[PDB]
Amino acid sequence: GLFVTLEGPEGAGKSTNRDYLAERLRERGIEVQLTREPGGTPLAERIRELLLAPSDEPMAADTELLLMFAARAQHLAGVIRPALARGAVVLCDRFTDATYAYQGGGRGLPEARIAALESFVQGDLRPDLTLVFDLPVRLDRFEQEDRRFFEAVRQTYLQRAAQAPERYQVLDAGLPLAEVQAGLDRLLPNLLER
Ligand SMILES: Cn1c(=O)[nH]c2ncc(-c3cccc(C(N)=O)c3)cc21
């Protein structure tokens, strides 16, 4: 199978582009499983609910990081690994790069602490390809965040893509839809090969 993750803020056309990619693969007779993080299983979605619900009690940054990984551990065992084992293409909306971006960049948690959790929870599993939807910068907890938080998120994704170029493709989400999809179209041949 192939593990593809999609990263980027809301409003960047990630969902419609994920559907587009799913259709181009399914039309070629490839099995595709769509999923998202945090979430993807009943327990993981209950965890997503705690992470998104605003509350008068502030959530510690360490709590936010640990809940993101707890949901990841469940989703990996329940959905992602089984899907990859069937030979499916998994198209996952957000994954550990979001942890580096939101919790590392956004919240200030050390990169090494995130890396240690990534290694614990995932073993050697990493996405085969990560599509970064780059976009210049009742509300849920992340929606409530300010411009600075989101600029840190944006730049973190870009830094990560630059560190491991072989695994990422940065798309300019500010461009028209048709333009972004043509980029996906051009990306398809390598995918069908990978
Ligand atoms: C998967 N993942 C992670 O590891 N750390 C994360 N932080 C935030 C989101 C997230 C989820 C829904 C919406 C938004 C948002 N509105 O920006 C962010 C997703 C994350």
From Swiss-Prot:
GO terms for molecular function: ATP binding; dTMP kinase activity. Transmembrane segments: none annotated. Keywords: ATP-binding, Kinase, Nucleotide biosynthesis, Nucleotide-binding, Transferase. The keyword Transferase applies. It holds the Pfam family Thymidylate_kin. It comes from the Bacteria. Its EC number is 2.7.4.9. It is an enzyme of class 2 (transferase). One of its GO terms (cellular component) is cytosol. It catalyses: dTMP + ATP = dTDP + ADP. One of its GO terms (biological process) is dTTP biosynthetic process. ATP binds at residues 8-15. InterPro entries: P-loop_NTPase, Thymidylate_kin-like_dom, Thymidylate_kinase. Gene3D superfamilies: P-loop containing nucleotide triphosphate hydrolases. PANTHER family: THYMIDYLATE KINASE, UMP-CMP KINASE 2, MITOCHONDRIAL. Phosphorylation of dTMP to form dTDP in both de novo and salvage pathways of dTTP synthesis. Belongs to the thymidylate kinase family. NCBIfam families: DTMP_kinase. This is Thymidylate kinase. It comes from Pseudomonas aeruginosa (strain ATCC 15692 / DSM 22644 / CIP 104116 / JCM 14847 / LMG 12228 / 1C / PRS 101 / PAO1).
